Write a protein that holds these residues in place. Structure first.
Motif, mmCIF file in Angstrom:
data_model
loop_
_atom_site.group_PDB
_atom_site.id
_atom_site.type_symbol
_atom_site.label_atom_id
_atom_site.label_comp_id
_atom_site.label_asym_id
_atom_site.label_seq_id
_atom_site.Cartn_x
_atom_site.Cartn_y
_atom_site.Cartn_z
ATOM 1 N N UNK A 114 -8.037 -10.612 2.738
ATOM 2 C CA UNK A 114 -7.677 -9.705 1.658
ATOM 3 C C UNK A 114 -7.737 -8.256 2.087
ATOM 4 N N UNK A 115 -8.614 -7.780 2.980
ATOM 5 C CA UNK A 115 -8.698 -6.365 3.308
ATOM 6 C C UNK A 115 -7.469 -5.783 4.002
ATOM 7 N N UNK A 116 -6.882 -6.528 4.957
ATOM 8 C CA UNK A 116 -5.605 -6.217 5.593
ATOM 9 C C UNK A 116 -4.419 -6.234 4.629
ATOM 10 N N UNK A 117 -4.392 -7.198 3.689
ATOM 11 C CA UNK A 117 -3.417 -7.201 2.621
ATOM 12 C C UNK A 117 -3.579 -6.059 1.618
ATOM 13 N N UNK A 118 -4.826 -5.740 1.236
ATOM 14 C CA UNK A 118 -5.253 -4.806 0.208
ATOM 15 C C UNK A 118 -4.894 -3.366 0.450
ATOM 16 N N UNK A 119 -5.102 -2.876 1.680
ATOM 17 C CA UNK A 119 -4.697 -1.533 1.989
ATOM 18 C C UNK A 119 -3.194 -1.412 2.195
ATOM 19 N N UNK A 120 -2.516 -2.566 2.385
ATOM 20 C CA UNK A 120 -1.110 -2.739 2.705
ATOM 21 C C UNK A 120 -0.626 -2.042 3.993
ATOM 22 N N UNK A 121 -0.108 -2.727 5.004
ATOM 23 C CA UNK A 121 0.660 -2.089 6.061
ATOM 24 C C UNK A 121 1.817 -1.226 5.568
ATOM 25 N N UNK A 122 2.233 -0.244 6.376
ATOM 26 C CA UNK A 122 3.290 0.709 6.081
ATOM 27 C C UNK A 122 4.674 0.110 5.936
ATOM 28 N N UNK A 123 5.045 -0.816 6.847
ATOM 29 C CA UNK A 123 6.379 -1.405 6.922
ATOM 30 C C UNK A 123 6.338 -2.920 6.737
ATOM 31 N N UNK A 124 5.202 -3.443 6.235
ATOM 32 C CA UNK A 124 4.979 -4.859 6.033
ATOM 33 C C UNK A 124 4.213 -5.106 4.740
#
Lengths: 54, 128, 234
Positions: free
Chosen positions: C194-204
């Motif tokens: 969830x932490x990688x999803x939560x902050x959201x990537x810039x182009x993903x």
RNA sequence: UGAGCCUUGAUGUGUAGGAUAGGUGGGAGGCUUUGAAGUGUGGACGCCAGUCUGCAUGGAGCCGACCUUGAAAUACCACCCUUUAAUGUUUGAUGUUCUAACGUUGACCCGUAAUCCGGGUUGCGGACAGUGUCUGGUGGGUAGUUUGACUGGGGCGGUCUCCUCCUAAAGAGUAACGGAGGAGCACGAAGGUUGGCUAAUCCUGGUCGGACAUCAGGAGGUUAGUGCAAUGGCAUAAGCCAGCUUGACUGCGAGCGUGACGGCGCGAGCAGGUGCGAAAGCAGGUCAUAGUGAUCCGGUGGUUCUGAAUGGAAGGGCCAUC
RNA sequence: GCCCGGAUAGCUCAGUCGGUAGAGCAGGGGAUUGAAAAUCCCCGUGUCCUUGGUUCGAUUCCGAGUCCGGGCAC
RNA sequence: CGCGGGGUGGAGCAGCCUGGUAGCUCGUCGGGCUCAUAACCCGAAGAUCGUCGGUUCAAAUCCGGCCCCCGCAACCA
């Protein structure tokens, strides 16, 4: 079409979707416009930005 | 730190013995190494060894072609040679002398030069 | 990967190292597969699939596990005494200036973060990001560095871990100990996913799993088939 | 035999360093029939003696761990870039060999008293030619058409739109291959506004432009200027300079000149918000008239306005604009 | 108006996996011949296009825009 | 008629696209080698861009008139 001087779009810097259209000599000075003008959607004078670019 | 020793990337084919052919003529001398069963293993020449001009048809230029060529076949691990000699040029015997001094053992110095039995008409060059 | 030594070929076949398995059973297996004689630590490599170009660009930060990491995130306090006493008390390794400033300049260090108030960083700065097999510096690229020592240490002891976009596009983070339950590791792993999803990537658009793989200190790793909300979503 | 995907194995020789610096987290060590190590023998091996290491032998430690040097430090497990062999794996590319499709306008038989045609045997060729669908080229062999008007006959030549002067007859400005010139843009200041100021030319003096710089004095009185053509214009400057600036505004718009219509021009004032100026006031491009393009079609952005059963969406509409 | 792909010795290219500015020919001087044509020699020049960025440092490695050359668009 | 191109040092050619810029090969003249000329070598000189005007700060260049040279055109019954 016309001249060698060419058309740019001056986009409002409020997040509202509005622009003025204007021609500018790219070759002689390509230093992009600032300039303040009316935006009718926020109904106030706001800085406009850019020149038909990302 | 490191500053290199090995002269090339590791050896290929590896045939131990070969034949050389020296085509010596009035304008240029070509030295071409082959296998016994007929395969070029490499060449060098006087003109390609950077002489040009009148130097291209000289015993000294012939020598330096032979030593250059001797480098090219080091990748084949060759040690013994036979040599074919071919044409009326200078460098004809002087190229051989450079091959034995390269550390190669030379089996025969077989002069092969191709001679018509009267045969086709030569050009008549230098005319009056 | 795991060495050519005669027993080490034997170990790698018998334990079933590297290749994929499902999150609850991979973690329960990971305790059984262990190569160390003692408590190994568990880390995750997470692949984001867009900007591997740039170390700054894909998401970076810190995230709350419900189980604060034991040995990993071994936290110390950098200051000669700036509002010290609670931060020194809490269970931290060491509170000071002199020993951690000499160690980090000389080179190698084993520990996680030594947390600084502004005046402490001033006297002894940090250097570099080429930290190899050795990871040992706080930075704005980790981003959890704002700003008080007792807060960040105590929050680490409750649940906090750090997360970072490494140059492969890979985010490496400690998830825990094999002392942890299979469940405890899985909750810590799911909090990271969830932490990688939560902050959201810039182009993903989400967690954006090209690969996730969880590895333990000497045991080996297990590549992970899912985004970790139970075993399988649908 | 290319390539992809993918299974295992691997190199990265900088500057300092003992050597080992593919990016980077974990991590204080790994002990089946040990984990030894180590000298020795060969192989791969390349920013040369520097790594990995079949294995004889040995069952008697690599080596970090703050052991040290260095931005990064090493052991040891993950991660994955490059190159990459081993190999797996699908597919392509290629040849050779086959024969069973398929050709046979080869032979021989039979229907047969046709020997066309069919059927049979047999030889030769052979997955090639062939033919159908798709598709790139070529294609006046064939076909359907097109190829301006003006015009002192028509062809040749010129010209076709828009501005200014004359003809034009002291309101409208009105023809002719009548007379004479230009435009197909420029401009973020060359626009706004406050504030200040006044020209060509010649003479006289003048350190080298003494025919003409810059200077000072006088006469003159715009003879100049005007982004670019001509006509009108202008000193309260519509000219020239300085300061702050974005009214080159969005919504409209009485009233009107103007044109067959399309359309084009003009504008007090009102509403919003603003710039300049102490204020009155000024400002909706440039001192005016040239600097252009109807409609369909299609593009980009905005807008609940609609969106073929309900809900959404392509799509359509309006607005901005290409 | 896109995707491409190039922008350096004067030139074309290129040593340029980021730790590190070249080959071929061009102009001057020297060295020899019925000067020359022609040998051999020693210098030839670049903040790699203007800006971002990874980093222990990198032009090139990752990126935005100007100009050249090649396609599909209309 | 008409339309388009041309007019450069003693010769043939270049530069001519809102412009300030004179270049090449011959020939020439001076010096040199050679008995002497030829050639060969070195140095130098030579065009106020046909002509007149106009626009321009500036014109060979752009614009207009005339003379001169060339190409094409000057028919249709």
């Amino acid at each position: 079409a016309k001249g060698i001087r060419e058309k740019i779009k001056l986009v409002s810097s409020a997040g509202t979707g509005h622009f003025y259209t204007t021609t500018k000599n790219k070759r002689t000075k390509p230093e992009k416009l600032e300039l303040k003008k009316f935006d009718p959607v926020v109904r106030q004078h706001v800085i406009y930005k850019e020149a038909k670019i990302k | 730190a490191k500053a290199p020793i090995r002269a090339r990337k590791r050896v290929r084919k590896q045939v131990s013995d070969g034949v050389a052919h020296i085509h010596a003529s009035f304008n240029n001398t070509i030295v071409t190494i082959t296998d016994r069963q007929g395969n070029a293993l490499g060449w060098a020449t006087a003109g390609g060894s950077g002489f040009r001009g009148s130097r291209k048809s000289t015993p000294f230029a012939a020598q330096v072609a032979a030593e250059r060529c001797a480098d090219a076949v080091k990748e084949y691990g060759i040690k013994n040679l036979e040599v074919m000699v071919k044409g009326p040029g200078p460098g004809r015997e002087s190229t051989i002398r450079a091959l034995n001094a390269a550390g190669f053992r030379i089996t025969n110095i077989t002069d092969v030069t191709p001679i018509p039995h009267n045969g086709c008409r030569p050009p008549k060059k230098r005319r009056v | 990967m795991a060495k050519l030594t005669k027993r080490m070929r034997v170990i790698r076949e018998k334990v079933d190292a590297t290749k994929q398995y499902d999150i609850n059973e991979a973690i329960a297996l990971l305790k059984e597969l262990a190569t160390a004689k003692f408590v190994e630590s568990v880390d995750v490599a997470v692949n984001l699939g867009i900007d591997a170009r740039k170390s700054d660009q894909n998401v970076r930060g810190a995230t709350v596990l419900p189980h604060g990491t034991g040995r990993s995130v071994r936290v110390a306090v950098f200051t000669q005494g700036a509002n010290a006493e609670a931060a020194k008390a809490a269970g931290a390794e060491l509170v000071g200036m002199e020993d951690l400033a000499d160690q980090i300049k000389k080179g190698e260090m084993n520990f996680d973060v030594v947390i600084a108030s502004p005046d402490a960083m001033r006297v002894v700065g940090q250097l570099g990001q080429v930290l190899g097999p050795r990871g040992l510096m706080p930075n704005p690229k980790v981003g959890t560095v704002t700003p008080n020592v007792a807060e960040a240490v105590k929050n680490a002891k409750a649940g906090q871990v750090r997360y970072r976009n490494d140059k492969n596009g890979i985010i490496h983070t400690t998830i825990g100990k094999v002392d942890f339950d299979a469940d405890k590791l899985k909750e810590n792993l799911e909090a990271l996913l969830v932490a990688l999803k939560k902050a959201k990537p810039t182009q993903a658009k989400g967690v954006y799993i090209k690969k996730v793989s969880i590895s333990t200190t000497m045991g080996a790793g297990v590549a992970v088939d899912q985004a970790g909300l139970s075993a399988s979503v649908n």
